[PDB]
């Protein structure tokens, strides 16, 4: 169960309860942030690259 | 108390309301 799952994830379901988020970049089902559409792994990867607008490391 | 739902301190713990903690 992989590619059929990232694909099953976008199509509108048999009931609206079954909506689950899949990381639009790599397809990770777990830890998917609404704001970016990404998983915490990709989150960090794009960010570190500087391809995430306004995003920078927090230091306090 | 903090585990006892039927009290003030108890519902503050859960973060809910009722007769034993009114809003």
């Amino acid at each position: 169960a992989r590619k059929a799952l990232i694909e099953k994830a976008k199509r509108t379901p048999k009931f609206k309860v079954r909506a689950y988020t899949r990381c639009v970049r790599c397809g990770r089902a777990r830890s998917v942030y609404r704001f970016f559409g990404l998983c915490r792994i990709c989150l960090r990867e794009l960010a570190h690259k500087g391809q995430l607008p306004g995003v920078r490391k927090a230091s306090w | 108390g903090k585990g006892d739902r039927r009290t003030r301190r108890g519902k503050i713990w859960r973060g809910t309301y009722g007769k034993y903690r009114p809003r």
Partner: protein, 206 residues
């Protein structure tokens, strides 16, 4: 494995994002995802040209994509040709005002993503991985650069025991934030598997 990514470490000081635009909570993802779809298509075609930096700007249903490259001619085409055939391809995905520029790279040897990309190529062509790295650094330094370091990990020469080999010259103060470090990564496919190439170029400090 310990070290920090030296690009993301410098954001807002010595290095600037490759996506400069604003959006609210309800729109951010949809635009960001387009930059993702765009950058792939661009680097799918423009890999040949010697792609260095993909800048994207936005306002409202319109976007200027500033592309940096070592062979501007292969990007622009025959008299305005290739750069055109992409504009249509571009606004096909975008569905909006696709303003696609092409900018000069005043030395691929001072471009980290280029230095790496070339080494990743040389070892796809069955070349001596040790020697090739010392050369990669030797180019960068001859172009006046302040310091250089280059790293390849993987089954070098096909070796069964994977190995990490590296080389360096000058300064590379990766702990220093007021110092400019251009970093580029290049992933080399082969028959025996994939090797990874890391390049760090110390231009000079601020």
């Amino acid at each position: 494995g310990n070290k920090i990514h030296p690009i993301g470490f410098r954001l807002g000081i010595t290095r600037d994002w490759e996506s400069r635009w604003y959006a609210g909570k309800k729109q951010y993802r949809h635009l960001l995802l387009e930059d993702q779809r765009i950058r792939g298509l661009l680097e799918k075609e423009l890999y040949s040209a010697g792609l260095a930096r993909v800048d994207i700007e936005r306002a409202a249903d319109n976007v200027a994509v500033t592309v940096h490259v070592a062979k501007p001619g292969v990007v622009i085409g025959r008299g305005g040709e290739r750069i055109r055939v992409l504009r249509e391809e571009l606004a096909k995905l975008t569905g909006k005002n696709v303003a696609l520029n092409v900018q000069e790279v005043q030395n691929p040897n001072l471009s980290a993503p280029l230095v790496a990309q070339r080494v990743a190529e040389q070892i796809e062509r069955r070349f001596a991985v040790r020697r090739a790295i010392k050369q990669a650094v030797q180019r960068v330094m001859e172009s006046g650069a302040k310091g250089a370091k280059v790293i390849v990990s993987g089954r070098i020469g096909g070796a069964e025991q994977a190995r990490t080999e590296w080389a360096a010259q000058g300064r590379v103060p990766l702990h220093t934030l007021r110092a400019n470090i251009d970093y580029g990564f290049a992933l080399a496919r082969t028959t025996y598997g994939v090797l990874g190439v890391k390049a760090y170029i110390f231009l000079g400090e601020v």
